[PDB]
């Protein structure tokens, strides 16, 4: 909606300029990391890792010429600096996880995610084809890891902490 997405200090989340941690509201002891999935040799899947807190920071990007993010905007989400597109999130079918969040090194002008208010924080919602129907991102437990993946109706709820510790 028309609500501005805010950080844990109540300040608007910026459009690309600043990085933020997605801190799970009931898993502050864990944080986002990359892991291997399937038979891949390099880690390209996004997990919630109990050994890293607060985890890898993200940037939220919209092509609109505005410097804040609203819940209604389609977003790219990416690891790494603004200048790099090697950490851009997408959702990719990968057995046996399902529709897994993974990183890729290409980026569409308009990404497929939205950040939507849920409970005490926000959920990440993936819209296949940037259509009207959104699928909640939650956790899928496989191979001793908690993968971020589509789990509609069971979102992982996050607060968004500006990454000023770096």
């Amino acid at each position: 909606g028309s609500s501005v997405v805010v950080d844990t200090n109540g300040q608007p989340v910026s459009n690309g300029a600043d990085a933020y941690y997605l801190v799970p509201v009931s898993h502050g002891h864990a944080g986002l990391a990359l892991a291997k999935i399937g038979n891949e040799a390099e880690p390209r899947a996004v997990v919630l890792d109990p050994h890293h807190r607060p985890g890898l920071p993200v940037r939220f990007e919209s092509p609109l010429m505005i410097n804040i993010i609203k819940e209604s905007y389609f977003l790219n989400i990416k690891f790494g600096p603004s200048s790099s597109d090697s950490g851009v999130w997408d959702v990719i079918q990968q057995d046996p996880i399902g529709l897994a969040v993974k990183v890729t090194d290409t980026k569409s002008l308009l990404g497929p995610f939205k950040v939507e208010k849920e409970g005490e924080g926000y959920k990440i919602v993936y819209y296949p084809e940037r259509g009207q129907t959104g699928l909640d991102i939650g956790l899928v437990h496989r191979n001793d890891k908690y993968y971020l993946a589509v789990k509609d109706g069971e979102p992982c709820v996050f607060k968004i902490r500006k990454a000023t510790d770096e």
Binding site: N15, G16, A17, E61, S62, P63, L64, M65, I66, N67, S82, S83, L109
Partner: peptide, 24 residues
């Protein structure tokens, strides 16, 4: 970023509004 909604003036008239683009 932050110029959204502002004017683009051509030949004395308001022609456009700042809308979107490819970053950076």
């Amino acid at each position: 970023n932050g110029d959204s909604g502002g004017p683009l003036i051509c030949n004395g008239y308001l022609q456009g509004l700042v809308s979107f683009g490819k970053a950076p």
